[PDB]
Design a protein around this ligand. Sequence first.
Ligand SMILES: Nc1nc(=O)c2c([nH]1)NCC(CNc1ccc(C(=O)N[C@@H](CCC(=O)O)C(=O)O)cc1)=N2
Ligand SMILES: Nc1nc(=O)c2c([nH]1)NCC(CNc1ccc(C(=O)N[C@@H](CCC(=O)O)C(=O)O)cc1)=N2
Ligand SMILES: Cc1cn([C@@H]2C[C@H](O)[C@@H](COP(=O)(O)O)O2)c(=O)[nH]c1=O
Ligand SMILES: Cc1cn([C@@H]2C[C@H](O)[C@@H](COP(=O)(O)O)O2)c(=O)[nH]c1=O
Lengths: 316, 316
Amino acid sequence: MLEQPYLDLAKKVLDEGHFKPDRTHTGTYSIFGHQMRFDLSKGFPLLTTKKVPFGLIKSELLWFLHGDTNIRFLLQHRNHIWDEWAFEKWVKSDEYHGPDMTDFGHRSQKDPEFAAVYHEEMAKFDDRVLHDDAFAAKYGDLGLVYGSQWRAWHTSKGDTIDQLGDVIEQIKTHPYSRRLIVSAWNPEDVPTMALPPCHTLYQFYVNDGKLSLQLYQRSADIFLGVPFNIASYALLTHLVAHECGLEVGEFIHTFGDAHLYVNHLDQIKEQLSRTPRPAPTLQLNPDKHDIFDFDMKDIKLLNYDPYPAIKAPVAV
Amino acid sequence: MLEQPYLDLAKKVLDEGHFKPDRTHTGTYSIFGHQMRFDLSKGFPLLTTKKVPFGLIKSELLWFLHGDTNIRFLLQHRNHIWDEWAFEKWVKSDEYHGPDMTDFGHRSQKDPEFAAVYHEEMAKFDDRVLHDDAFAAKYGDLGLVYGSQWRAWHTSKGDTIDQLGDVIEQIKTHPYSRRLIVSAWNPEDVPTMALPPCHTLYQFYVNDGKLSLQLYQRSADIFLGVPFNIASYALLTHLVAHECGLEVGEFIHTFGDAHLYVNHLDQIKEQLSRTPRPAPTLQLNPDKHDIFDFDMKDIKLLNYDPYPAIKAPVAV
Ligand SMILES: Nc1nc(=O)c2c([nH]1)NCC(CNc1ccc(C(=O)N[C@@H](CCC(=O)O)C(=O)O)cc1)=N2
Ligand SMILES: Nc1nc(=O)c2c([nH]1)NCC(CNc1ccc(C(=O)N[C@@H](CCC(=O)O)C(=O)O)cc1)=N2
Ligand SMILES: Cc1cn([C@@H]2C[C@H](O)[C@@H](COP(=O)(O)O)O2)c(=O)[nH]c1=O
Ligand SMILES: Cc1cn([C@@H]2C[C@H](O)[C@@H](COP(=O)(O)O)O2)c(=O)[nH]c1=O
């Protein structure tokens, strides 16, 4: 039933992959060369074998689609996924002169001053991100994130081109235009960067009413990693299919280094013994038909019963 | 045996694809979502069922790898594939004041002043591209082609970053670096363009000695189109595997709008009745170990016996 290419993609990786050592230095079992499909009329490819949370995919998303980059907002919509990049900023800070969080993620596991106290050096950084907007502005803002790669490309001439907005009007002016891609890989910015964009480029189609998507993820982690990467870019197919009064066909998923990080070997084994406890339905409000302003409760995902949720250590 | 994912990929397209009308306006039978692999120790995925010519893939290539864009050279190495873009320039020309080639490709089929006379308006353009270098310089130069996207990205600051050169030194400094891609999609240049780059981005790996490639072709034509697109980017895997003293594993091929243009329906049917008359061997000279200067005869492809060669009309 729907999420099964991810269940079928993890099975292949863990006996049959090749161990490959990553930077974090706790290897993998990987492939490279993988392509995966979902058909969104058989609903949402949201993972019933463990619990994936939707709220926090849905919040992430809109943030990107608003041409935003200020974590300030992720916090308001109760989100904190992108936190630690702005923190890596404030603890190496010019003006957080005092109680340092040096090496804090690969020393979460190790605790004792990072234990709570870094996680709450962090939340306190966070409130100034929420009240001294001088600190949202000048700290919660990661700059070159997907919302500035998809809606604010900085051009050879100082300003911005909005790229997911031409997906939306070209889907609409010439439909079955073979060129309908947005790249977020920006050559001249990958080296000074911390994570260049995992989700490099995604190609659109307008099939025949069916809006169909395909994402090119060069890096990919099966387990924590890929469950949120099926469900942000299938929600894009729904949103966009709806934006030009077209109707969802299918989301496809190209991979690079498809990987199941050696470290979380036995919790993936743990999932492939839960049987895909049916499929959710995303509905999105008929009355709002943009995609760019969507407050949170217009896109709603009906009927989820997941399995209980399976848990990781320290990501890096 | 080796080229069979292309033979298997065309069979699926022509009964089972969906007709989709392109700009040229002679539709298709297409898919979208396709991923294809080749393993280059079982030699070269060069097409024995019809005849593909190698010389002219090999010349094309080096041109791109020299950071070049002047058709002047393609001509010298007896190549004329990229011609008509510089001609579309010289017949709409400020200073080809007289004998016009208005609409010339979608009116090759139709002939009579384009018949020979445009093809030889063309070759004459060409000689000035070869002798009045003022005309190579200011006419044979397409500018933003793959050699300036792979080796000369124009940055938000006037100059160039050389991107296939960091594939070559990063493959080499940190090997199993998950980020090893070159994009040629340049957002802010796709609209003023004629063909934005079909071969958008390609990802590297360094498997374990095996250099492995994957190309992201958004558009793709099975028949004329895709045969040259298997064999330029597998030759890149050989060249690059050899450049950092690594050894070829495999080239993979991601597609977008995988297509068999309706127009050449019965010559593809014609191929899938030739049985894959074994496999060539590319050898490349031990003595040259760069990839950037390669004159033509260092990369040599041994033992080809193709089927006779099957032929198209007017591409556009
Ligand atoms: N290995 C890897 N996987 C990633 O998910 C990840 C990474 N590396 N480093 C950079 C990055 C940052 N994006 C992300 C992705 C997920 C979360 C997150 O909060 N959710 C995890 C939690 C699972 C658990 O710990 O129980 C997830 O499932 O994705 C945070 C930031 N993504
Ligand atoms: N449909 C399509 N296919 C393409 O090959 C093509 C296109 N469109 N338009 C832009 C473009 C330009 N690149 C190319 C590709 C191939 C040739 C070429 O000389 N070789 C063909 C010839 C086959 C025949 O006519 O008998 C080939 O097989 O690719 C020229 C320019 N590529
Ligand atoms: C932001 C992002 C990163 N990642 C990952 C997985 C990798 O193990 C981690 C570091 O990868 P990298 O070294 O290829 O950049 O980033 C995802 O899986 N999804 C995401 O959206
Ligand atoms: C330059 C290039 C174009 N093409 C194609 C196939 C398409 O039918 C033609 C026009 O496509 P487009 O409208 O998607 O740009 O360009 C290739 O197949 N290979 C190439 O390398």
